[PDB]
Amino acid sequence: DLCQECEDIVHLLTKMTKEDAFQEAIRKFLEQECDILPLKLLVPRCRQVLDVALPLVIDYFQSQINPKAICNAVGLCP
Amino acid sequence: DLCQECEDIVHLLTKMTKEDAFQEAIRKFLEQECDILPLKLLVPRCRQVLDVALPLVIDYFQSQINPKAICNAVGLCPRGQ
Numbered sequence: 001d002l003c004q005e006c007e008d009i010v011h012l013l014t015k016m017t018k019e020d021a022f023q024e025a026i027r028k029f030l031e032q033e034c035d036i037l038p039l040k041l042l043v044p045r046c047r048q049v050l051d052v053a054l055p056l057v058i059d060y061f062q063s064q065i066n067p068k069a070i071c072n073a074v075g076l077c078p
Numbered sequence: 079d080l081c082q083e084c085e086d087i088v089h090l091l092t093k094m095t096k097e098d099a100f101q102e103a104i105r106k107f108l109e110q111e112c113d114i115l116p117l118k119l120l121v122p123r124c125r126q127v128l129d130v131a132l133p134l135v136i137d138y139f140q141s142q143i144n145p146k147a148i149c150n151a152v153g154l155c156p157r158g159q
């Protein structure tokens with residue numbers, strides 16, 4: 001079933017985001033990807049967009065108090 | 079630690095990509111997001127980029143024999159590629 005799997009993924013994402021090593025690794029990977037294709041071409045000013053957005057997403061996943069809500073927002077749960 | 083968690087996430091994504099309802103739902107959500115902020119401004123021609131990339135990503139995850147590789151590519155596991 002896709003809804004239980006989505007809930008598990010969101011739970012894992014929140015747990016993972018509560019670790020600084022995760023944030024550092026994802027930041028370095030995305031900073032690298034911003035300098036090369038495909039992101040270099042599909043996302044202008046990629047590095048600045050990353051610097052601004054990645055903390056927002058980290059906080060978003062560190063604050064969500066309802067996985068089912070997110071999975072419904074994406075269309076995987078009712 | 080984060081390596082087992084990353085492998086579990088990749089395994090779940092691989093499992094999900096085999097169901098077509100997942101693909102349709104993700105397409106619907108991303109088409110919605112492409113028409114509004116922030117993606118409307120951060121991704122020029124968002125809808126076309128989506129139409130081109132989503133199938134590639136679906137296939138990439140449907141042809142994955144070992145999650146470790148992805149987790150190694152992002153730096154959460156010390157080996158995999």
Ligand SMILES: CCCCCCCC/C=C/CCCCCCCC(=O)OC[C@H](COP(=O)(O)OCCN)OC(=O)CCCCCCC/C=C/CCCCCCCC
Nearest residue numbers: 109110111112113114115116117118119120121122123124
């Ligand atoms: C108005 C300047 C236009 C751009 C100028 C470029 C120079 C750099 C200026 C920096 C600021 C630029 C801000 C523009 C950001 C991009 C906005 C954008 O993406 O548009 C989309 C967005 C809609 O997207 P959604 O929210 O998803 O739709 C559903 C919501 N119901 O709509 C907007 O454009 C945002 C609002 C635009 C504000 C336009 C300003 C109008 C000014 C009229 C007043 C007259 C001038 C006042 C004095 C000017 C000062 C000297």
Ligand SMILES: CCCCCCCC/C=C\CCCCCCCC(=O)OC[C@H](COP(=O)(O)OCCN)OC(=O)CCCCCCC/C=C/CCCCCCCC
Nearest residue numbers: 006009070073074104107108111116117127128131132135
């Ligand atoms: C669709 C996200 C990426 C693929 C997800 C794969 C399924 C994994 C399980 C789901 C993980 C959690 C999903 C995260 C997205 C949830 C975002 C959300 O619900 O809120 C929308 C949020 C604003 O929230 P609110 O203002 O409170 O609500 C009003 C709605 N505008 O807006 C956004 O999220 C904008 C950013 C959307 C993410 C864009 C992801 C990048 C897509 C790029 C183009 C396509 C690439 C193809 C990727 C294929 C993925 C397998």
